[PDB]
Amino acid sequence: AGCNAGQLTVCTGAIAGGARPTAACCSSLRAQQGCFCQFAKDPRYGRYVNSPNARKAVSSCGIALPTCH
Predict the structure, then answer these.
(1) 10 touches 25 (CB < 8 A)
(2) Residue 60 has what DSSP assignment?
(3) Handedness of CA 48, 16, 32, 41 (dihedral sign)
(4) Cβ distance 43 to 2 under 8 Å?
(5) DSSP one-letter string for 26-59
């Protein structure tokens, strides 16, 4: 599943409704958005990703919520 439980952990502000310090992380994701395609497959994302804040703030870190949508 994904590759967020490693990268995203910092970028959790995004998926967690509060991407502030993660702005640099944004550009990081933009550099490795490829594995977030897996995240987008929602294998187990949807339990994580989606829950608590993604719901109302999936973000826009602008690296996209780099689901390979």
Answers:
(1) yes
(2) -
(3) positive
(4) yes
(5) HHHHHHHHHHHHHHTT-SSHHHHTTTTTTTT---
Q: What was the elucidation method?
A: NMR
Q: How far apart are CA 39 and CA 59, in angstroms?
A: 15
How many residues belong to the chain?
Answer: 69
What value does the CA radius of gyration of the chain take, rounded to a whole number of Å?
10
Tell me how many degrees the CA angle 45-15-47 measures, rounded to the nearest 5: 25
Joined together, the tokens standing for residue 29 give 């994701």
**What DSSP designation does 65 have?**
S
Out of 2.40.50.220, 3.40.50.1820, 1.10.10.10, 1.10.110.10, the CATH code matching 1-69 is 1.10.110.10
